């Protein structure tokens, strides 16, 4: 019986889709590689050639021979996967009986570490396993072909009969990322980390009008063309996977809920004296504690937790929750990246006072940098939230009006004062332009359950520009800066400034800090 001849089929590997940036610059490119395999049965008839073959494969001669001897019953084994076709011709030129070639693909990432987290990485079988390569793996993968052959009883192909199914190439994908901005962000976030002795950071830039992520960088990063180091922490796309309490950066949302309530206008006053406010066993405290009456703008400039808490008590937590929820804090982004973290927005039927206050000033909720950026985008886009995209958006979908345009425009103006006013976040200023935003500084949560860390902080800045017709929103998060100056306004705001200055000019956005006509 057995099988004198035997009809078998083999997979024809499909070319993986090119990934570009939004201008067509290549970011992931399928590279023809040569994979060498062998038929041990056929090898058994040319043992005299093995030691030269082992040498060519950088293998110990005995270990190589042991490997073939032990796999002698098999008909297929890899010798080496993915060599350059030039390396592959070297071994093919030995002309060893039983040694054969297949054309595979392997990705090359021309921008390397600069866009590694966003673009991602493929596994040994050319499948996506992080970032866009994973999120769009079915678009990018195409469909393998099917080639029909005849094989003898000891595994040797006797002829190519025909292609029963043609391989179908995967399709091109243009990201929303602009590599010019991505490089600028990458460089300035790296510099800031190093300058501050920080442990990690993220920086997201978004188009407020289109929902597009124009830049997304994290430190530490890695070189996805280096398939050896296997360093899982440097591979974390922190902007999408590492949640944090946003702190004072959510106060503009609390204020939006205050203005929409009917009960508050920007010139109304809150008494924040003496810088603390006792709520049962918890004490709300401000960092700076030499104020009494502050107007709502001043509450933001001084970043008074006490002031925002008194407003929260007056309007109720439900209104604040609703704004936060509607702008996307702790909510699914829709981006469909496996392993993206949603974080958490807490909810109550009856909010207690402490939960009410801490929510209003940014504790007891966990967000991602992408969420935070999208929320600022909505605010900047006169209160309209356009769906987030990591792919280039040619036709913009309808956004959802999540904050009224009048309230969002009032809040814009207040954030411009936060940047421009005396005692504000002057380091976030963008020469030539009107910029707007909000600093934060949060103690990190302690890892052994419990409470909060004494000496360890996260520094934040979130903002947009130009104030008079916003185009770009940005979030800068730096984890555990190490110098005496650790506040968001010191550490993160100058990154915002430098990156907004370049980004606006790369986008040919006209300077708006002009005379009055
Ligand atoms: C829920 C308990 N729990 C947890 C942690 N926690 C907290 O980490 N507090 C920080 C805070 O108050 N941050 C505010 C908004 O971020 C203000 N804005 C900063 C900014 O603008 O950079 C600021 C000007 C430095 S103070 C803080 C404290 C100390 C130093 C710096 C910042 C609380 O307060 C708090 O009760």
UniProtKB/Swiss-Prot annotation:
One GO MF term attached to the UniProt entry: peptidoglycan glycosyltransferase activity
A Pfam family: Transpeptidase
InterPro entries linked: Bact_Transpept/Beta-Lactamase, Beta-lactam/transpept-like, FtsI_transpept, PBP_dimer, PBP_dimer_sf, PCN-bd_Tpept
Catalytic activity: Preferential cleavage: (Ac)2-L-Lys-D-Ala-|-D-Ala. Also transpeptidation of peptidyl-alanyl moieties that are N-acyl substituents of D-alanine
Gene induction: Mainly produced during exponential phase of growth.
Cell location: Cell inner membrane
Gene3D superfamilies: 3.30.450.330, DD-peptidase/beta-lactamase superfamily (3.40.710.10), Penicillin-binding protein 2a (Domain 2) (3.90.1310.10)
Enzyme class, first EC level, given as a word: hydrolase
Tagged with keyword Membrane: yes
Taxonomy, superkingdom: Bacteria
Catalytic residue positions: 248
Membrane topology note: Single-pass membrane protein
UniProt keyword annotations, A-Z: Carboxypeptidase, Cell cycle, Cell division, Cell inner membrane, Cell membrane, Cell shape, Cell wall biogenesis/degradation, Hydrolase, Membrane, Peptidoglycan synthesis, Protease, Septation, Transmembrane, Transmembrane helix
Chief location: membrane
Entry EC no(s): 3.4.16.4
Keyword Ion transport recorded: no
Any GO BP annotation: cell wall organization
Protein family according to the UniProt entry: Belongs to the transpeptidase family. FtsI subfamily.
Stated name of the protein: Peptidoglycan D,D-transpeptidase FtsI
